[PDB]
Each structure stands twice: as C-alpha cells, then as structure tokens.
C-alpha cells in the first residue's frame, strides 16, 4: 500500500526548465488529493475534464506529474488550446486535456539578486510542439537560407534564452513553479486510486 510520491514533486528544492520539463511517472499507489486541495493562499487549481472533489472517487491507470518553471505572464498558456512561445515551443497541452494545472509564485526560491539565469526557455523552433512533446535540442536555429553548421551569429541563433529571475521584477515576470497532473485511463488495470 504505497503512497503516491506527491511530496517529491511539489516539495522538490529545484525544478527543471520549461523546455526540458521533468515528468514523474506515478502508478500503483494510493493518492491523497486532500493535500493538493488547498496548499496555501496560491489557488492555481484549474482542473480540465475532471472535478477536484471527484478525484478521490476515481481510479486511473497512470498519473503523470509534469513540473517546470515559467514567468507569471505565461501561466495563462499552460491550458488546453493556448498559443504563445511557451505553449507552441515548450509545453503544449492537448485540446481534450483531462487533468489539473497547479502553479504558485516562487519568487523567494528561484530568483537571485544577480539574476537566476539557470531557468531557460525555447525561443526559436521551426514548427509547433505536439501535446506532451519535449524538445531538448540545442541546435543553432537557421532563420535564413544560409546553413548555420553550428555557427552562432546572424540568422543563426541559439534556440534557448534565459529568464534572469530577479526578486524585484514585476509579478508577471517573477518565477512560477508549475505542476501539471495528467490523468490517463486506457485499456489497462487501474492502479492509482484515492482514499
């Protein structure tokens, strides 16, 4: 009777960058959604396709926990049917997404006085991301007709940019930690129930 490792995802000391978002496969455990009901004053708890009060009464085959960090102005894109640099090139949710999205302001954790350039995001990509696609490529983006051959310069730019989280920034430009819980139920034995 193992408990689902939700503490390991939310209470992790470091989160991954949005372009290389981490995914923890959670299965064969007893899930407690009452600790995610109401964590703190941050109430980023928009659930899509499923009700929060009904999660304890449902069993799922697998539960995926995706974690990353973006700015405040970009949390509105972590939702089904959204567009933008984050939604199109970093982390895209399907149109029929069934799950909940959680976010909280982590300005006291992920922002340094000199700028926390550790968190990155993808700026250039030739096409949009499919749902639940992770692109960790760092190939020099070819914005012109001349081939780059790994030479950074004009029309040949590095596809990743830094966030530079400073604690004095505006709320919209402060770091936010996001945890997306995907609920899957395909032809398989359901192992993640509530209690």
């Amino acid at each position: 009777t193992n408990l689902c490792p939700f503490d390991e995802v939310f209470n992790a000391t470091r989160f991954a960058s949005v372009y290389a978002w981490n995914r923890k496969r959670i299965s064969n455990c007893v899930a407690d959604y009452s600790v995610l009901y109401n964590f703190a004053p941050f109430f980023a708890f928009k659930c899509y396709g499923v009700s929060p009060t009904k999660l304890n009464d449902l069993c799922f085959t697998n539960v995926y926990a995706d974690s990353f960090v973006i700015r405040g102005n970009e949390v509105s894109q972590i939702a089904p049917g959204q567009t933008g640099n984050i939604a199109d090139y970093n982390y895209k949710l399907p149109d029929d997404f069934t799950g909940c999205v959680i976010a909280w302001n982590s300005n006291k954790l992920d922002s340094k006085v000199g700028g926390n350039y550790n968190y990155l995001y993808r700026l250039f990509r030739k096409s949009n991301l499919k749902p639940f696609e992770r692109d960790i490529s760092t190939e020099i983006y070819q914005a012109g007709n001349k081939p780059c051959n790994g030479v950074a310069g004009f029309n040949c730019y590095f596809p990743l940019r830094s966030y530079g989280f400073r604690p004095t920034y505006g709320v919209g430009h402060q770091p936010y930690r996001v945890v997306v819980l995907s609920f899957e139920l395909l032809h398989a034995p359901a192992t993640v129930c509530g209690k």
Partner: antibody, heavy 117, light 110 residues
Framework: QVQLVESGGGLIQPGGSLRLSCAAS????????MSWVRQAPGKGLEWVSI???????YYADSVKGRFTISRDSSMNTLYLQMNSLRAEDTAVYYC???????????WGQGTTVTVSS | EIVMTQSPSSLSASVGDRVTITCRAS??????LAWYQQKPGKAPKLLIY???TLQSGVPSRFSGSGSGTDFTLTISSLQPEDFATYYC???????????FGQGTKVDIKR
C-alpha cells in the same frame, strides 16, 4: 542580399480591400517571427500583426476581424490582407523580421496606403 | 495594455553633448525593451535590444540602461548623423501590443 521589399499599397476608398506583399531574400519568412508595423503621417510606430514560425498569429485590437496575415513559403513572401479599410488605416506599412528579445533587426522600405472617400 | 511614456518629446543638443532619453512603462516589464532610430522618410533602425545590449553595427557611443519600469538611452558624444527621432519598444509578449514610445526628436541646438 538581405532585404524586404513591400508592394501592394495605394489609394482605396473606405471599406475596400487591399493586399500587401513582402518579398524577402536572405531571411526565410516561414522560419522567423514576421511582423507588420505601420506609421501614420506625423505619428509614432504601431504594431499591427505577427505570424510565428509555428503558425500562431496575433493581431492588434483595432484590426482584429479585418486583417489577415499570411505567408507563401514557396514564394518566401509575407502577406497582409486588409479588408474593411478605414481612414485611420492610412499609414506607411512596414514588414519586418522580429527577433523577440533581440529586437526587430530587418525592416522593409515601406509601402504607402491611403484610405479616403 | 502597457503604456510606454517617453520623455522628452523634443530636445535640443549640439555636437558632442551627452544626450539622455527616458522611457517608462506602466508596469514592470523587466528587461524587455528596445531602442530605435528613425530619420524622415527612412525605415527605423535598431539600436539597443534587451534593454541594454548594443545591436551589431551601432556605434559604441550608444548605450542603454534600466530595468523594470525606468529605462534610459544614452549618447555619450552626439555626432552629426545622430540628429533624428528615437523610439522605445516593449518587446514583452504580454500583453501583446509591443507598444512604442511617443518619440523624442533631437534637433540641432543653436
């Protein structure tokens, strides 16, 4: 030769339709953030529309429902279809390659659109 | 929408002066700002991007500074080819817009 060449501007009565073209060489339209910026006589710059390399488009509130940005990858050309034109649309229309955080580096020479009855 | 208030509207300067232009956003935009130069009848020219990074090919007398809401462009030694109109832009993609400043005309002081 890195340059943007605009065309299609001219005189048209209000409510008419007009299609601007932006022929590019050097920069690939289907691979870049391409933006349309206009400037009325004696006024400042105003952003109009943008088309992402992934296909996402975004329009200003004043031209939502009237303008449609597009591109022909085989022609390497950016387009701005302007319907329901109004007098306040009279401006020089620039097409430009947007680099987001790196500014807007490549500008066209501009085409003049005049809407008057 | 973000409102970019640029000041002064016009300023007079002789060759060699230290020129300063101010650009203020209505809310925190961190470092998402750019400066442009425009001469009558010509297309705009990118000078500074990312608030304080100098575009390639721009003379080193140009320099940007500031972060958050208050930004300043600085010409350390005004040259004859620098008499023009300058704009600031909010490259931040929220709320879209990419609002430009009102503009500052720099004429010849006499």
């Amino acid at each position: 030769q890195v340059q943007l060449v605009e065309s299609g501007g001219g005189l048209i009565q209000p409510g008419g339709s007009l299609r601007l073209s932006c022929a590019a060489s050097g920069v690939t339209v289907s691979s870049n953030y391409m933006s349309w910026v206009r400037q009325a006589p004696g006024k400042g710059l105003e952003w109009v529309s943008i088309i992402y390399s992934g296909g996402t488009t975004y329009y200003a509130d004043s031209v939502k429902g009237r303008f449609t940005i597009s591109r022909d990858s085989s022609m390497n050309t950016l387009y701005l279809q302007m319907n329901s034109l109004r007098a306040e649309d009279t401006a020089v229309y620039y097409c430009a390659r947007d680099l987001m955080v790196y500014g807007i580096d490549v500008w066209g020479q501009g085409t003049t659109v005049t809407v008057s009855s | 929408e973000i409102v970019m208030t640029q000041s002064p509207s016009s300023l007079s300067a002789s060759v060699g002066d230290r020129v300063t232009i101010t650009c203020r956003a209505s809310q925190g935009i961190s470092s998402y700002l750019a400066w442009y130069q425009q001469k009558p009848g010509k297309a705009p020219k990118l000078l500074i991007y990312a608030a304080s990074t100098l575009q390639s090919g721009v003379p080193s007398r140009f320099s940007g500074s500031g972060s958050g809401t208050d930004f300043t462009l600085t010409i350390s030694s005004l040259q004859p080819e620098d008499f023009a109109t300058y704009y600031c832009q909010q490259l931040d993609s929220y709320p879209p817009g990419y609002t430009f400043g009102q503009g500052t005309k720099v004429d010849i002081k006499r």
